[PDB]
Symmetry: C2
Subunit: 74 residues, 2 copies
C-alpha cells in the first residue's frame, strides 16, 4: 500500500472504547446483515454510513430481546 487515506461520508460515532468492542463483536456476528463499521477510527470511534446506521439504532435499543430482522419470509 501507499499510505492510509480513508475519506468518506456517513456518521461518525464515539462514546466510550467499550462501545468499540461491541461494534466489532456485532460485525463478527453480522446480525444485522450489514457491515456497518467501515473503518473504525481512533480507538473510540466508529464510522458507519448514514444510510444503514438505522440498523445500529435498533441494535442499540432493541437487541436486549432482539431487533426485528427476519427476512426469511418477510
Amino acid at each position: 500500500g501507499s499510505h492510509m487515506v480513508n475519506v468518506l461520508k456517513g456518521v461518525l460515532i464515539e462514546c466510550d472504547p467499550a462501545m468499540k468492542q461491541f461494534l466489532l463483536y456485532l460485525d463478527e456476528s453480522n446480525a444485522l446483515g450489514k457491515k456497518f463499521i467501515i473503518q473504525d477510527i481512533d480507538d473510540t470511534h466508529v464510522f458507519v454510513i448514514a444510510e444503514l446506521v438505522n440498523v445500529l439504532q435498533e441494535r442499540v435499543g432493541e437487541l436486549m430481546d432482539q431487533n426485528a430482522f427476519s427476512l426469511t419470509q418477510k
Copy 2:
C-alpha cells in the same frame, strides 16, 4: 473523569497529519468563513461536514490561482 462523546454527520478524513496542520491553520484563519473542521478525531483524523465540503472543494480546486471566499454576490 471525562471522555468525549461525539456523534456527528459529514465527511471523515484519514490521511497523515500534514493535512491536519494546514487545516488547523486554515481553521484558525477562518478563510472559509465556516468551521469546516468540526472535530479533530485525534491527531490524524479530521472531520469536516458535507454541507461545506463544497467550500473545501473549491478551496482545493481554485487555490492554485486564488481561493476567493469573499462573495458579496460572486
